[PDB]
Write a protein that binds this DNA or RNA. Structure first.
Lengths: 167, 140, 260, 172, 73
RNA sequence: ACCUCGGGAAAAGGAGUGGCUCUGACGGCGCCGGGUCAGAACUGGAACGGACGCGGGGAUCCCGACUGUUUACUAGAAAC
RNA sequence: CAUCCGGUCGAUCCUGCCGGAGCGCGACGCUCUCCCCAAGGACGAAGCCAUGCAUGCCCGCUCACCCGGGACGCGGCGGACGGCUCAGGACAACGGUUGCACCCCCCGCGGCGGUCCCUGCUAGCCGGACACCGCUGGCAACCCGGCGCCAAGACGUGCGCGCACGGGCGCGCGCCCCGCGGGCGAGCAGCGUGACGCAGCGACGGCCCGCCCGGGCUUCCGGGGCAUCACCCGGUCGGCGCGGUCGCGGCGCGCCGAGGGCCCGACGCCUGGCGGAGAAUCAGGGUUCGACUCCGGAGAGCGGGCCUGCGAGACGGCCCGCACAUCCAAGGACGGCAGCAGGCGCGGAACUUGCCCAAUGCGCGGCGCGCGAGGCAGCGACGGGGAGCGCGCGAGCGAGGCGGGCCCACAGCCCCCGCCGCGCAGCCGAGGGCAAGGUCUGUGCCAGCAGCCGCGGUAAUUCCAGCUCGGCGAGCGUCGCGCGGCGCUGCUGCAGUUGAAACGCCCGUAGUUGGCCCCCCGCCGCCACGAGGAAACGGGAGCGCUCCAGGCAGGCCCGUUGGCCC
RNA sequence: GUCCCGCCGGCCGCCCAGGGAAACCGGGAGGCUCCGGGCUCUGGGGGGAGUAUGGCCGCAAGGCUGAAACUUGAAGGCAUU
RNA sequence: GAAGGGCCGCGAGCCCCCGCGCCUGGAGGAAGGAGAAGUCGUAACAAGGUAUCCGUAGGUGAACCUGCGGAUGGAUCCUU
RNA sequence: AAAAUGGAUAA
């Protein structure tokens, strides 16, 4: 079931192509692993058997990620406080999905240990003294099962803040 | 004029023969498929039938003779065909409501010679060969 | 197909081994091992069919599992194990010390060589890769995965595997001036010298090869193999890569029946 | 499935394009008398071979002269004819092949070469002799008269190792 | 189209039953990024790529122009 | 289907419709209307034109083309 | 391997087709003396099936009530290959060519082989339960329950060495372009460094990397008809995320833009549509066939849905819906031969419920099993080959019997040596084509014959016999089909004044076709030669299966072969 | 002189080759089996049949496209008596 | 963490609704083709007794007839 | 000016 094969799809001129084969395990798909944050139960990540003996960590829920600074490279294990602006869909960020590529608020407290230095990314250093630092999840929870993010910096910080500034 | 004398007129040339080719009567009967449906025998060499009634068809006016024929009902497609009992005195062996084998007259379905309305022959009556019951080799 | 193919049909089986079309729809399986199906000959073919040795396939197997046979410095009791180019097929118990090399015809046949030249099996480096972490590696056609290679060897180079010693000590390049035995396509098994090597982007590099008498053969870079800088590194089959022409083949064969 | 089906077996008969011409048919009775051939098929058998032997040559005779392919393919055909003996060591050339005829091909048969020696009597007795195995090149009492004894073994042709100890006529 | 470019590869086909040739064409699809500026009627070389779409499997790696006011290239 | 090509036609036959919570569109000029629209949640015994207002439909046949008019107080028609 | 000929007339030359003639491959009729190479329920029923089989093998483990080997269980490995059909699929499968810098991969092969600390701590080796079974149970059956004993190379923890490391995450090219190698043709790759995960690996160190064998896609092309199918498509066409997958891709899923394909036939429908390598028939050019043998595909009653796994959307696996059945103790239970043999139906049509691994493979086992893959036998005039049915006037044989031998898994056959001895023809014609009576009875345009012209009305060259004779021959006729015939399809190579056929004409876009000229370069097309592409098959060199149809053999031999051109 | 020779575009009669079954064309129906300048239509024995149906166009009458089943051995061209 | 549930997906099946392909029953109506020697006229081929025939429209038991324009494939290669 | 017809089947 849940096939990814091209027989079902229409051709280039939009001509339907008749099916010549029953579906096969080589092309398969599963109900997607939407990844729920645990803001409100420890992180539990199912392990799903895959083709080739390899295994994929199904992210039913995740709570903590490794986020790294854009210049000083602090890289601190932290908590994903909340999720905003998935861009692929507004609703995914309203159901707290942690799909990779989503701005997430990370707790400032572990990464506040880096507050001592100055000339160090002043716009984010202000955000470090503020209870949340925006970061974009950079690994796929649905396959990897572990979500790590990079600190929001550079022009992207400006756009993703511009996006969250009407609020 | 066959014309189309162009290096780049192979497309036109290929189709012109394909379209005009169907016109040839022999090719048209051969591959239209109208006859594969029409043939009572279904294109089979021979087909089984049940005898419905012995009939006499007068031959063409040049050759005046009462040809003797049997109306047979094909078992496969329930078509009422007329077969000609062959040779001399053969009708006496044939009985009504009796199984029969029927095969082509050899002109390719067309009537052979002077038999009006007849296109098929009776190879076997009730299993036993018609020729055998005529040559005496196998009797009733 | 579902899973993996498990049997071999003789009619599909190759023209190079040459099996009797009659006597079995099936053929011995080129079972997995050191040499590839296109470039290998099953040992049970080189035991039963080649030397006309033991009688049946079951009988061949009984000797095989009695540990009576040796291949490439180890015994290997597999019944249809692969035997390839330069695979030292020799039996110590029969004292038959041979090696397997390609004929001018294109069927590898046994070329006799003693322990002195049976100590080392010649091979070519096809791929250099970083494997098992950052340890650079070297792979030969018979799946001989030596580890850290010598700095001089790049690729299309030649390695003297040492059998029981199993190490690389002698390295020969493919650059023009090294005698090259062709192992693919039409020439498929005759020696020569490299007239030139020519490359095209992402396309088969064509290496010119002319025999000692003359006669050109232009096989692609993958099939080309460097047997020696000059002369065989181990031995040449008694054809020396002459390739006698079609009438010449008739000439040799006609007197062959007369000799009896 | 079954190695049996991978056998190439064909037909040697070369049936005529027109089956009822009396000039040809009556000569068939005449050739049948000349070599004692049992069936029209027994002529047809060598009719195919004869025409084919001439046909292969008619290709290589008009083929590029002194060509390597012609030399190898011509060598085979001429050699076949020298050992069988239809062609000769004087002729030794592609040109002579066309002249061969079906009866000239029949000459090499054991119904014909036995007749030249006269070991087995007239072609009538001669065919009877091979079936009765009283004639052979030697050591293979031939049952089949079709055996085309080659020129080398025509001199070697002989009466059976065992002819006619309790002969059938005087057996009782 | 959006970052796409449809190309007509036209070739002559030598049928043998009639010694004559046909005239056939293939409509192919390629990705052109703002690197190259093209117009319909321009000649471009497209290289094969990891499937980039259902039909776009090519990338424009060369571009030549044509006078601003069937050729088997 | 049919057709005088306009009609038939609302053909037939289906699906949805509440409350709340939000969000894009629409203008004048930087402040200021408008009440129509799409959406998207979340929710309520499986309930939403919740009262009201408000076509049953289809296949033919016979008249008369039709919109019209008529026996006020028994015939509204195919009659005029 | 370039051929005709019967037929429209009182005759003649045509056009034009009807008829023969040959070859293939099937059905049928009558017939057939032995051998040899034998196909064989493909054919608008991929309809339905009784019965029996088609995958078991091991022994890691034994305290089974006989020996240290085991009955069974459990553990292991293979059951996905093999066998069968050909329904679907008509820009798909499928042939050649490409790429994976978008992948996955059992087994074998060779290399690698530190696994962090709280770790956890016992490695002189740990933990408990676990079938078979003991005892007791339930039903008519399938079928399992409980309690206790308990068996391991099974599991489950865990001996663990800070260049600790499964996967995954941040920062680690430049500055107009390339010109070195772990590399490549291409920035691909490795590895450090910072965080995570503490992860795979072991209680008989194996996780890994390469390799093999492959699968997943994919490029450039080839890849049925139908216009009484002309407009078509709506994740369809693109971009941008995000999922999903072994991975790339509308593969899904949001958001955006309006694309995509066509007279060079799009789209739709149709097909007694698997495709190729190949066949048949044949101067050349071809034309039809492609069920079957090898290669690729797809299906197992029909739809789906899933598990064990490295791989299966598997049916001699499961789970459902649908039909179609069974069995029943009436509560229940259990299916699926398009495997082999054999039914039943259907058709014109297609064989024994044989035996056996002995071969040739393959699985498992190193201390021989397992195989309805097959091998053999039976049936077997699809056919194909080779001798018969006398020869000679007198010499003999063989189809058989009868005993050996040999062959043989075992009988058998072949083949041998004795002893004996049964040689043995049919189907079709005889006016013409077309070969072969100017014979005789019967019968009267009746009967019949006759492919086609014709014969039969009281002299039948033609029917019904008999006599002769001709064809081919243990085969010969009769139908159905294709090809040659047939320049009756015309590219080579058709015909259009009258035989059949220039649209009444003009304008004209698709197409299709186009002067002359400009040596000396790019892209063509092209021209030639290559390289690399499966054998079979076609041919083709050699080799007396007794000839042969055959075959890769054989011989005191080229490393003896088995080539070689496709 | 409305002469003579004509030069081109037509309208025509006879016809040399040459072609064709011939009637006969010959300013082609000649330069073809010693076959190939280009483009287009159209036919494939004679009936059924321009018939049926599916369109489409037309006020209609009808036009254009266009079957098959089925039958039959001749139909037909130009000539000579 | 068993029996269960809630919700999506993948998806049979059944029913309805339309499209298509494929065959088919049927009074009665209208043809066509073949039945050894039916009835009614004689249209056409001789200027076939009214030269034939093409178009188109009208008539008539039936061939056929007549109108109006055409061809010669005519019964005319010939005439201020 | 008026005139229609002639079986079949071989000869």
């Amino acid at each position: 079931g849940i096939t990814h094969d091209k027989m079902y799809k229409r051709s280039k001129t939009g001509a339907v192509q008749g099916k010549w084969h029953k579906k096969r395990k080589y092309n398969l798909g599963r109900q997607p692993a939407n990844t729920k944050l645990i803001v409100k139960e420890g992180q539990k990540i199912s392990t799903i058997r895959c083709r080739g003996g390899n295994i994929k960590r199904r992210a039913l829920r995740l709570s903590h990620g490794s986020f790294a600074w854009g210049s000083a490279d602090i890289s601190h294990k932290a908590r994903i406080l909340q999720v905003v602006y998935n861009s692929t869909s507004n609703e995914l960020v309203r159901t707290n999905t942690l799909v990779k590529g989503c701005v997430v608020q990370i707790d400032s407290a572990p990464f506040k240990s880096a507050l001592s230095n100055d000339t160090l990314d002043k716009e984010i250093l202000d955000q470090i003294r503020g209870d949340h630092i925006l970061a974009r999840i950079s690994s796929r929870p649905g396959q990897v099962g572990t979500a790590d993010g990079y600190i929001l910096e550079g022009p992207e910080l400006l756009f993703y803040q511009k996006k969250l500034a009407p609020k | 004029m066959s014309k189309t004398s162009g290096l780049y007129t192979a497309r036109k040339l290929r189709t012109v023969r394909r379209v005009n080719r169907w016109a040839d009567k022999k090719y048209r009967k051969a591959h239209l498929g109208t006859w594969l449906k029409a043939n009572p025998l279904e294109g089979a060499c021979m087909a089984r039938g049940i005898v419905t009634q012995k009939i006499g068809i007068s031959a063409k006016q040049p050759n005046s003779a009462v040809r003797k024929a049997v109306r047979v009902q094909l078992t496969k497609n329930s078509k009422k065909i007329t077969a000609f009992v062959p040779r001399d005195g053969s009708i006496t062996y044939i009985d009504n409501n009796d199984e029969v084998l029927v095969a082509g007259f050899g002109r390719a379905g067309r009537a052979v010679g002077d038999i009006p309305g007849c296109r098929f022959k009776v190879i076997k009556v009730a299993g036993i060969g018609l020729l055998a019951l005529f040559l005496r080799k196998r009797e009733k | 197909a579902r899973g993996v193919r498990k049997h071999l049909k003789r009619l599909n089986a190759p023209k190079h081994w040459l099996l009797d079309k009659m006597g079995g729809i099936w053929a011995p399986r080129p079972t997995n091992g050191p040499h590839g199906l296109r470039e290998c000959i099953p040992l049970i073919l080189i035991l039963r069919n080649r030397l006309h040795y033991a009688n049946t396939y079951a009988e061949t197997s009984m000797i095989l599992q009695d540990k009576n046979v040796l291949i490439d410095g180890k015994p290997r009791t597999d019944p249809t194990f692969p035997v390839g180019f330069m695979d030292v097929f020799e039996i110590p118990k029969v004292h038959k010390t041979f090696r397997v090399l390609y004929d001018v015809k294109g069927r590898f046949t046994l070329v006799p060589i003693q322990s002195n030249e049976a100590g080392f099996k010649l091979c070519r480096v096809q791929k250099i890769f970083l494997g098992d972490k950052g340890m650079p590696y070297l792979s030969t056609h018979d799946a001989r995965t030596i580890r850290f290679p010598h700095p001089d060897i790049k690729t299309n180079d030649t390695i003297k595997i040492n059998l029981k010693t199993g190490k690389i000590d002698e390295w020969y390049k493919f650059d023009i001036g090294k005698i090259v035995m062709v192992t693919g396509g039409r020439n498929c098994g005759r020696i020569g010298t490299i007239q030139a090597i020519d490359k095209h982007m992402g396309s088969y590099t064509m290496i010119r090869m002319k025999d000692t008498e003359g006669t050109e053969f232009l096989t692609r870079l993958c099939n080309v193999f460097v047997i020696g800088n000059d002369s065989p590194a181990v031995a040449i089959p008694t054809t020396k890569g002459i390739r006698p022409d079609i009438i010449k083949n008739r000439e040799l064969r006609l007197r062959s029946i007369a000799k009896r | 499935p079954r190695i049996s089906r991978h056998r190439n077996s064909s037909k040697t008969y070369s049936t005529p394009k027109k089956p009822f011409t009396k000039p040809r048919l009556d000569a068939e009775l005449k050739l049948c008398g000349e070599y004692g051939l049992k069936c029209k098929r027994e002529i047809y058998r060598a009719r195919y071979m004869l025409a084919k032997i001439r046909r292969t040559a008619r290709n290589l005779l008009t083929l590029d002269e002194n060509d390597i392919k012609r030399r190898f393919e011509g060598a085979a055909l001429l050699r076949r004819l020298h050992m069988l003996g239809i062609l000769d060591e004087e002729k030794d050339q592609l040109d002579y092949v066309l002249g061969l005829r079906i009866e000239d091909i029949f000459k090499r048969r054991l119904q014909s070469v036995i007749v030249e020696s006269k070991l087995a009597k007239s072609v009538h007795h001669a065919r009877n002799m091979i079936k009765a195995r009283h004639i052979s090149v030697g050591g293979q009492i031939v049952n089949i008269p079709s055996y085309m004894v080659r020129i080398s073994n025509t001199s070697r042709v002989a009466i059976a190792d065992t002819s006619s100890g309790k002969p059938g006529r005087t057996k009782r | 189209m959006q970052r796409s470019i449809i190309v007509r590869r036209d070739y002559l086909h030598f049928v043998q039953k009639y010694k004559r040739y046909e005239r056939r064409h293939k409509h192919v699809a390629a990705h052109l990024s703002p690197c190259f500026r093209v117009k319909e009627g321009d000649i471009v070389t497209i290289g094969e790529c990891r499937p980039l779409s259902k039909t776009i499997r090519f990338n424009v790696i060369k571009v030549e122009p044509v006078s601003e006011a069937f050729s088997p290239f």
